[PDB]
Each structure stands twice: as C-alpha cells, then as structure tokens.
Design a protein around this ligand. Structure first.
Ligand SMILES: C[C@H]1O[C@H](O[C@H]2[C@H](O)[C@@H](O)[C@@H](O[C@H]3[C@H](O)[C@@H](O)[C@@H](O)O[C@@H]3CO)O[C@@H]2CO)[C@H](O)[C@@H](O)[C@@H]1N[C@H]1C=C(CO)[C@@H](O)[C@H](O)[C@H]1O
Ligand SMILES: *[C@@H]1O[C@H](CO)[C@@H](O[C@@H]2O[C@H](CO)[C@@H](O)[C@H](O)[C@H]2NC(C)=O)[C@H](O)[C@H]1NC(C)=O
Ligand SMILES: *[C@@H]1O[C@H](CO)[C@@H](O)[C@H](O)[C@H]1NC(C)=O
Ligand SMILES: *[C@@H]1O[C@H](CO)[C@@H](O)[C@H](O)[C@H]1NC(C)=O
Length: 863
C-alpha cells in the first residue's frame, strides 16, 4: 500500500522484523519519518459468516475471526455487528462479543433504540464480507465518510481497534488535550484519552476529560460529518495522513455513531441530539467570576472582593477554594481563618453577587467519638464508598485532607448521601453554585495507600500512551469496585457520575433553580449538567494561545460554558500578559480569573486603581455585559437546538478555505468576531477577515477589509471586536452584576449587510428557573430589517419580565441618513423618535423610543 495508508501493527514497542513476522504483518522499513515499518496485511481480521439479517432497526451480521496470532491476549472468535438506521442523519453500529456480555457505558442520557429504521436516509451503509469492512457514504454525492477497509477490526478482551479513512484533513475534536492548534495535525499523531490530573502544557498528554467525538468538514460546500465512540476504557486515537483515524481501546465494546450534516453546526446539533444538549446556564454564571487558591483568610478574600468592587469591575461571582474549609475537608469551614463566613455570604448577596464553593469528591476518613467528621460517618453508614477489589473494603487514598475514602457516585444511594451533605452545609453557608474538582478521580498516591495488585486490570497487555504509562497513576486502582463496574471500565466516568449526582443534589438544595456546577473531569454528555474549565494552566503566552482551540473544542463537545484560568493559574503573571488575557477573557463563554497558591495577586484591581490593566479589563467586561442578552440567546440555542456558542470561523465561513485552520480568532455565535493580541510585545495582530461586511464594534465604522488577511492595529488597550453585517444584536446597559444589569434598558445593534438587510433574535426568561424552555415559559422575538423597515416579531410569548424592559436605543450600522422615522405598534402609530446621524461613519442611532419587550413593532424610515 501507499505508505500513508499503512496501519501500524506494532503500536507497543520499537518495530522489529521478528515481531512483525510473529504477528503476520508486513515489513518495510524504507518509509519516511513516523511511517510504520510494520503494518497490517490486506487480510488479517474478521470475515462475515453467512448472511446479514434484516431487523426492524437495520441489520445484524455475524463476524468470525480469521485465524490470527494472539498479541494482546484473549481474542474474540464470534463478533456480532448490530447496525441501526436511527435517524436520517445518524447511523449507529456496534460490535460486541456474540457469546458474552461485555461492559457498555451506562450513559445517563443515551437510550437503547427501539423502533424502526428511519426513512429518507442521507447516508448509505455498505458491508464487505471477506475481509469484513463497513463503509458509510453520503447518498447525495457518494462521498465515502467512514470506511474501515483501510485496516483490520481487532477485538480482544483488552484490545479493540478499528480505523476509518477520512474524506479530508479538516478534522476537529477529541479531548481532553492541549492540541495547540484547532485543525488536527494529521501527520502521524497519537492522542491518549484517559482522565488524568495533569498539567495542560505542550506535551500533548491525556488530561482531565474523555471526549471521543470529532467533526470533519468534507469540502467548501459545508458538507460535514462527525463520529463518536461510546467507550469509557483507556484508549488512544491515531491520526495519519492517508487521511485516517484509528481508535484503539483496552476494553468494552466498539459502539460507534456516525452523524451527517449540511454544515459543521448541523453535525454538532446531531451529536448533541444524541448525547445530551448543554444545560441553559443561570444568567448570573455568564458574568465575570473571580477566584484564587489560598486567599488564606476571609479577611484576605474580603479585601480582594472589596478592591474589585471599589473599581466598579463587572463581577458577579466569587469562588471560594479549599482554604475556606476546616483543614481542607468538605462541608466545613475554618472557624478561625474563615470566622464570619455566613456574614460574608450575606454581604456578597446584598451586593448582587454569588458564591461558588469548591467541593472535592474525596472524604477524610479521620473520625472518632471524640471528634466526629459527619460526612465520613454518614457516608460509611450508607456504605457508598468505592471499594477495593475484595468488593467490601472501602478503598483508602490520599487527597487534600490526608487519607480519604472516595464516594461511589454511580450508586443512586450515593446521590442521596451527597444531597444531604449539601443540605446540611447550605444551612450554614448559603452558597449559590458548586465547583467540583479533583474528580478524575485524582489521588495523591498511585492507586491506594497500599498501591495496586499486579493483575490484568492494573497491568494490562497494552497500555495507551497515557502520562506516566500506568493506569493507576495519580488515581484509584483499576480493580476498585463501584456500582457500575470496576474502575478499569468506569474510570473515565467518575467526573461524569459526580456531575450527575451534583445536579441531583441541586434539585433539593436549590429547588427549581439552575444554580451552577463547574467540573474538571468530563465525559461525553457532561455539558447537560456542568460548565468546564481547562484546568491548571500557566501564566505564559503559549497558554494564552492554546486556550482558544480548547474553548472551541469543548463547544463541539456540548460544554459551551468553558474557559481557562484567565491570567494563568501557576506562576506570577506579567502585567502585559494578564492585560491581554483579560481582554480575551472578557469573551470566553466561562470568564474566570483564577490563580494558584502563593503567586502574586492577579485579580484585576491588584494592578492599581488607575492602571491600564484595570481600565481595559473594566472596559471589555462592560462590553461583555452589554452583549449578555446576545450571549444568553446563544446559550438558549445551544440548549434547545445544539448550536455552538464560541464558534470557529469555519462554522460560518466554511466556503472559504482560509478559515479552516484559523484558531487565533473566534466568533460569538454567527455575528461577533473576536481578534485578540496573542504575542508578547505586540500592538498588532495578523488576523483573517472573513467574506462578510464587518463593523468595528466601538465606533460602528465599516472596515475596508473583506475575505483577506490583515494586520489589525491593536494597541495595549484594545482587542479586535467586529460585528457581522446581516445580524441584529440585542444589548442591555451593563451594571457591575447581572442581578442589576437585567433591570436595565435594552438596545439593538443592526449591522446591515450589502443588501441593507439584517436578522436577529432575542430569548428572554427569568434567568434562573429550571425547565423554563421545556415548560415554555419564555419570550422569543425575532428582528428583521429589509429596506426602510425593522420588524420586531414575537414567536413565543409566555414570560413577561416584571421590570418594564424596553428597547430604548437602536443603532444602525452601514446606513445612509434615515429620515421620517416612524414607529408602529401592532400596526398602529404611535411619537417621533430622536435620530442622531454620523455621515462619516454611516451610523444612525435612534433614541427617545420605548419598544416594550414582548410587543410587536415596526420601525420605518425613508432616505
Ligand atoms: C493546586 C494543584 O496542585 C496539584 O498540582 C501541582 C503539582 O502537584 C506540582 O507538582 C506542580 O506541577 C508541575 C508539574 O509537576 C510539572 O511536571 C510541570 O508540568 O509543571 C507543573 C506546574 O505548572 O504544580 C501543580 C499546580 O500547578 C494538583 O495535582 C492539582 O490538581 C491542583 N489543582 C486543583 C486544586 C485546587 C485547589 O483546590 C484548585 O485551585 C485548582 O483550580 C484545581 O485544578
Ligand atoms: C462496598 O462495600 C460495602 C460493604 O462494606 C457494600 O455494602 C453493602 O451494601 C448493600 C446495599 O446497600 C447492603 O445490603 C449490604 O449489607 C452491604 N454489605 C455489607 C457487608 O455491609 C457495598 O455494596 C460495596 N459497594 C460495591 C460497589 O460493591
Ligand atoms: C513536559 O513535561 C515535563 C515533565 O516531564 C515538564 O518539565 C516540561 O515543562 C513539559 N514541556 C512542555 C513543552 O510543556
Ligand atoms: C446598578 O446596580 C446598582 C446596585 O448595585 C443600583 O443601585 C443601580 O441603580 C443600577 N444602575 C443601573 C446600571 O441602572
């Protein structure tokens, strides 16, 4: 074969002819760098035995192992293929052991399919028998999307592999990793996935979460597809320039979904329709969050809070890290250093702010009659810990408080215990949201305080290239035992089960409210429950650059509320870096400045009351808050439809191949282009301006650039923000908290396209009740402008905000002078508004107007 198509037969060691021969593979060392010297032969694997059988849902096939050397042990002789034409755009196939039940992910959202093959498929499936392969092609153009024929199917108990050709190199996704770029390097790269507490740095290791989804943009027409593997065992994904991708996992089953869409966004919508769309956040979670590890005392925390409030920083949320606890134990506070914590909570609340508390899964096991630790006693009484391999002894590890046991969040009763612990603590400290951390789960000892037994779970025949090369490193023994199964199988599901339990707890502690959950470890579908942050980064320019692809990727995974620690967790942050990162950070969907222990303060007001950093931070945060109605509506669409929030340029501009690798800029939704300075010393940025009309956000002037690379001038106080022609942006006068800003006058920004038309929408509900979308208690309105006329149209009208909200300002960009501006209500005029016009900038602002939110209006003008 073409060397780019070789599928490596020796993933586990340096390639030798002797091993190649024993494995029945092909040997050819004469390739280029990273081209496998030993690769699978053309007929190695499985063949279809007999006929495929039609089922109501699709078909099944029996696959029989063609005689083969047992490399990673216990091979599976009879494999069952079950294929289901689940929807017109989603294909599901699974390969199981015909004769034995194997571990399958007990996902909380995904259900087994019952019912019949879908009509009007956008795809076709083709099965080859001798040797087995499966191919999924797009019906419209016969483009081959998934094609396993490039390599073997391998299916041993602890080694399962399938490959697929890909129709392009525009591949985005997989996680959790620092990829450094957004479009994948298809040049022989292997990405291990196994939830792990480690530093998101340049080493390309497995990190906190496990995300097997990827999306492929087929060509400039926008046609795209995506693939998801429902498997929670350690795995790695191998990318090569064929182009092709190989999944290699060490247990469970190969359970694949293939999704087709007409655009990249439609693929994401299809993926999220399957795994679970993201929670609609509390509107307050959209504001700016502040945090650090080790304020040390409530006095220190209060001083930080107070200087940022004194500076009028938009600032909704304060996080309290493990320093609030009594000796780093959950569900206590330090009665000396945090004496008066409940009074401080009241102060936060009186100022319109929210408290988010960190909670760790591990529970101190140090409790006596003399000094009881309630959470451990109650947990032991309920028998809800993760056990050792004997199945009866709670496993002992070590985390922040010292020796600890670990809750088994897969046990339904564990959620009852967890809920009661939060109820009890909420009675003392009235926190508003929960930050779940260390939930990979992270262990300061490897496996347990007594290590791990040598066995096939702790020491498997094949180990993907995870950091440190052992599964149990900085986590639990793989033979530890939980309600859903052994840690070997469910390790990647710990943070997911914990988020599910935590949301369950919120039902009791925050009745009928969304609250906020922020989680470190994630699995596919975690976004239904929680926000995410990109973990323990560093105050470097590299970390700032690497943040954007990480944010875009999590939006693909349906965790749109995601961001890094702005300014950098580890290390003292330089002023210039923190200023640039604050500017960018004002536009991360989850915007939090957080800092590690002992490092110099990096909260915005710490740089000085009159500093450039503070001024610019406040400035761009005030822009974020102004655009919160737009951001919120983008979250409404992510929740209800499955759209991304932070979005790659290529999701909107896929026709333009110059956007396919852009990862130094991004969009909010379709209409706002963010262009940060990402280089030390720079007052410029080399940026791409897509094929659209664009307007400078602050001045409203139309840029001359279109569909081209530019050097954008961005001095130390600026970040690029441009509005897309053809879009209408709802705004609301900002205040330093969202409690307050939500009572303010609204505005519209109408950015006219080349045809002097534009469209937009606004979702509005109470900002905090759970299920307002499912129960249809909300306002959705639509704005459109087509020559001389803005129409405000109400499509859903079941919530009326009691604060008398109205649009009191309309700003029109790219317009000739309007004249004779008329306002009609339900067709009835209806008042002559005030119009200000800038003939140099071609901007009109209409004021002295009061268009009540929830009412239909026409605003008309002449030229
Ligand atoms: C607070 C943090 O502590 C732990 O991580 C720290 C490591 O223990 C240190 O070894 C050091 O890591 C360095 C690596 O060893 C080195 O290989 C290189 O990559 O640089 C690293 C530093 O950049 O520093 C680590 C912290 O930077 C622990 O493993 C980690 O999970 C902890 N972070 C969480 C805990 C808290 C405190 O409640 C929160 O504040 C954080 O946001 C959590 O993410
Ligand atoms: C971990 O071990 C404990 C025992 O230490 C198991 O607790 C059992 O729980 C069931 C259901 O709650 C009770 O009916 C039994 O009486 C408990 N056994 C004992 C010996 O008390 C628990 O099931 C274990 N967890 C897992 C995942 O196996
Ligand atoms: C990679 O990891 C090592 C620890 O093994 C660390 O010291 C180093 O800084 C990392 N390198 C990069 C490029 O991030
Ligand atoms: C902003 O909120 C404060 C409460 O902190 C309130 O006093 C004030 O009236 C609000 N002002 C605005 C922006 O209209």
């Amino acid at each position: 074969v073409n060397e780019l198509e070789r599928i490596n037969c020796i993933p586990d060691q340096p390639p030798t002819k002797a091993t190649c021969d024993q494995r029945g593979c092909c040997w050819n060392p004469q390739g280029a760098v990273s081209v496998p010297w030993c690769y699978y032969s053309k007929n190695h694997s499985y063949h279809v035995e007999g006929n495929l059988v039609n089922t109501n849902a699709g078909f099944t096939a029996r696959l029989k192992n063609l005689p083969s050397s047992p490399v990673f042990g216990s091979n599976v002789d009879n494999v069952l293929l079950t294929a289901e034409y689940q929807t017109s755009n989603r294909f599901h196939f699974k390969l199981t052991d015909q004769t034995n039940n194997r571990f399958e992910v007990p996902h909380e959202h995904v259900q087994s399919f019952s019912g019949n093959a879908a009509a009007s498929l956008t795809y076709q499936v083709e099965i080859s028998r001798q040797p087995f392969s499966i191919k999924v092609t797009r019906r419209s153009n016969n483009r081959v999307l998934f094609d396993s024929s490039i390599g073997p199917l391998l299916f041993a108990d602890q080694f399962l592999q399938l490959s697929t050709r890909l129709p392009s190199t525009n591949v985005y996704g997989l996680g959790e990793h620092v990829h450094q770029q957004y479009r994948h390097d298809m040049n022989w790269k292997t990405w291990p996935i196994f939830n792990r507490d480690t530093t998101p740095n340049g080493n390309g290791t497995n990190l906190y979460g496990a995300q097997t989804f990827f999306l492929c943009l087929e060509d400039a027409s926008g046609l795209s597809f995506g693939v998801f593997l429902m498997n929670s065992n350690a795995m790695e994904v191998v990318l090569q320039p064929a182009p092709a991708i190989t999944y290699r996992t060490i247990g469970g089953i190969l359970d694949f979904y293939v999704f087709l869409g007409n655009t990249p966004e439609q693929v994401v919508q299809e993926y999220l329709e399957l795994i679970g769309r993201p929670a609609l956040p509390s509107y307050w979670a959209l504001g700016f969050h502040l945090s650090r590890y080790e304020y040390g005392t409530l006095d220190n925390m209060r001083e930080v809070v107070e200087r940022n409030r004194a500076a009028q920083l938009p600032y909704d949320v304060q996080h309290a890290d493990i320093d609030y606890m009594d000796e780093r134990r959950d569900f206590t506070y330090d009665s000396v250093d945090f004496k008066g914590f409940p009074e401080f909570v009241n102060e936060l609340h009186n100022n319109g702010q929210k408290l988010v508390i960190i909670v760790d899964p591990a529970i101190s096991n140090n409790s006596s009659s003399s000094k009881p630790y309630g959470p451990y006693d109650r947990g032991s009484d309920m028998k809800i810990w993760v056990n050792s391999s004997d199945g009866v002894t709670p496993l002992i590890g070590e985390v922040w408080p010292g020796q600890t046991v670990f809750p088994d969040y897969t046990n339904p009763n564990c959620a009852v215990w967890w809920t009661k612990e939060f109820e009890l603590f909420h009675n003392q400290v009235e926190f508003d949201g929960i930050w779940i951390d260390m939930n990979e789960v992270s262990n300061f000892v490897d496996g347990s305080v007594s290590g791990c037994s040598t066995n096939n779970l702790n020491n498997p025949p094949f180990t993907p290239r995870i950091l440190d090369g052992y599964l149990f490193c900085k986590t639990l023994c793989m033979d530890a035992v939980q309600h859903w199964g052994k840690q070997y199988d469910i390790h990647n599901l710990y943070g997911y089960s914990m988020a599910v339990a935590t949301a369950e707890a919120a039902k009791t502690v925050f009745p009928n409210k969304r609250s906020f959950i922020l989680t470190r470890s994630t699995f596919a579908g975690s976004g239904k429950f929680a926000a995410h942050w990109l973990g323990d980064n560093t105050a470097t320019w590299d970390d700032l650059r690497w943040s954007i692809p990480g944010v875009l990727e999590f939006n693909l995974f349906g965790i749109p509320m995601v961001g890094p620690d702005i300014c950098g967790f580890a290390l003292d942050t330089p002023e210039e870096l923190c200023r640039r990162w604050m500017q960018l950070g004002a536009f991360y969907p989850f915007s939090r400045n957080h800092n590690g222990q002992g490092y110099k303060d990096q909260d915005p007001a710490s740089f000085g009351a009159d500093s450039l950093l503070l001024n610019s931070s406040r400035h761009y945060l005030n822009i974020r808050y102004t655009l919160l109605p737009y951001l919120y509506t983008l979250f409404f669409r992510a929740h209800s439809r499955g759209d991304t929030v932070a979005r790659p340029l290529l999701h909107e501009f896929y026709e333009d191949n110059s956007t396919w690798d852009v990862h130094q800029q991004f969009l909010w939704g379709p209409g706002l282009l963010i262009t940060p300075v990402l280089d030390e010393g720079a007052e410029k940025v080399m940026a791409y301006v897509p094929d659209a009309v664009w307007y400078d956000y602050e001045t409203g002037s139309q840029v001359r650039w279109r569909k081209q690379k530019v050097e954008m001038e961005l001095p130390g106080d600026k970040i690029g923000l441009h509005l897309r022609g053809g879009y209408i942006f709802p705004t609301q006068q900002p205040n330093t908290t969202t409690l307050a800003s939500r009572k303010n006058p609204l505005g519209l920004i109408i950015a006219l396209d080349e045809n002097k038309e534009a469209k937009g929408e606004l979702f509005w509900d109470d900002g905090e009740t759970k299920d307002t979308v499912a129960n249809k208690v909300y306002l959705l309105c639509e704005f459109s402008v087509t020559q001389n006329r803005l129409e405000v149209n109400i499509s859903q009208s079941t919530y009326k905000d009691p604060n008398n909200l109205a649009f009191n300002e309309i700003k029109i960009l790219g317009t000739e002078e309007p004249s004779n501006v008329t306002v009609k209500h339900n067709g009835v005029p209806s008042t002559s508004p005030t119009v200000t016009y800038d003939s140099n900038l071609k901007v009109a602002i209409i004021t002295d107007i009061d268009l009540l939110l929830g009412e239909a209006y026409t605003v008309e003008w002449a030229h």
